[PDB]
Structures are given as structure tokens and as C-alpha cells.
Amino acid sequence: VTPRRDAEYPPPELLEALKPLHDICAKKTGVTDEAIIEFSDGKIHEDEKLKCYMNCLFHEAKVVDDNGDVHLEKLHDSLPNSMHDIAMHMGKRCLYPEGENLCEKAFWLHKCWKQADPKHYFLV
Numbered sequence: 702v703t704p705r706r707d708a709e710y711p712p713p714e715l716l717e718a719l720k721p722l723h724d725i726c727a728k729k730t731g732v733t734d735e736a737i738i739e740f741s742d743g744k745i746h747e748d749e750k751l752k753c754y755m756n757c758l759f760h761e762a763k764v765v766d767d768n769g770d771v772h773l774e775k776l777h778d779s780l781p782n783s784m785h786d787i788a789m790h791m792g793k794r795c796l797y798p799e800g801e802n803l804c805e806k807a808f809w810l811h812k813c814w815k816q817a818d819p820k821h822y823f824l825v
């Protein structure tokens with residue numbers, strides 16, 4: 702369960718692709734750096750700005766359907782090949798997000814993934 706953090710994982714090319722999305726979403730949502738890093742490397746915690754940040758990243762990454770809900774196939778296909786099997790196992794019992802709004806369902810997904818596989822979960 703200890704987070705995996707080394708030269709290959711999270712993939713540096715994915716981190717570099719996420720950085721401009723982070724910059725957009727951090728300013729739109731106001732989330733704190735401490736909130737992101739705790740959720741990534743530490744414990745699940747509940748923060749409304751963080752939930753909105755998670756929804757915003759899915760929108761900025763273009764992995765949402767016409768209603769703004771995550772399209773898990775588009776998401777899976779956007780990850781590096783090195784992460785295809787890790788992501789599949791992390792997400793196979795997280796198919797159907799619950800929540801009344803898009804921030805809540807984004808948070809639901811991130812909690813579900815982090816509980817399923819805390820070693821490979823990360824957030825930036």
C-alpha cells in the first residue's frame with residue numbers, strides 16, 4: 702500500500718501533460734497545494750475545492766462525455782501504455798460514480814481508485 706514514486710511512475714510524460722491542466726484547474730477552483738498532496742500521498746480527505754479540482758481536470762483532459770461525466774474508456778485510452786493494466790485493475794470496480802453533481806462524482810471516483818490501489822494512486 703505505500704505509494705509508488707520513482708523515475709518511471711507516475712510516468713514523467715503524464716506528469717508533464719498534467720501540469721498545464723493543473724495550472725488551469727488550480728486557478729479555477731482555488732484548491733490548495735496541501736489538499737492535493739495529502740490526497741495523492743496521504744489520506745482521503747474531504748475538501749470542496751479539491752472535489753471541483755478533480756472534476757475540472759477531467760474536463761480539461763477531454764475525458765468527459767457530452768454531459769460532463771467521466772468517459773472511462775476515453776480516460777483509460779489517454780494514459781500511457783505502461784499504466785494500462787494498473788489503471789484497469791484500479792478502475793474495474795469503480796465503473797459507476799455516485800453523487801448528485803459532477804464534483805461529487807469526480808471525488809467518488811478518486812476515492813474509489815485510491816482505496817482500490819493506494820500504491821499506484823496519485824494526484825497532481
Ligand SMILES: CCCCCCCCCC[C@H](OC(C)=O)[C@H]1CCCC(=O)O1
Nearest residue numbers: 773777788789791792793814821823824
Ligand atoms: C475497464 C477498466 C476501466 C479503467 C478505467 C480507467 C481507470 C483510471 C484509474 C485512475 C487513474 O490512475 C491510474 C493509476 O491509472 C488516474 C488517477 C488521477 C491521476 C491519473 O493520471 O490517473
Ligand SMILES: [Mg+2]
Nearest residue numbers: 717718720721
Ligand atoms: Mg511540452
Ligand SMILES: [Mg+2]
Nearest residue numbers: 723724727734
Ligand atoms: Mg500549482
Ligand SMILES: [Mg+2]
Nearest residue numbers: 739742743744
Ligand atoms: Mg501522512
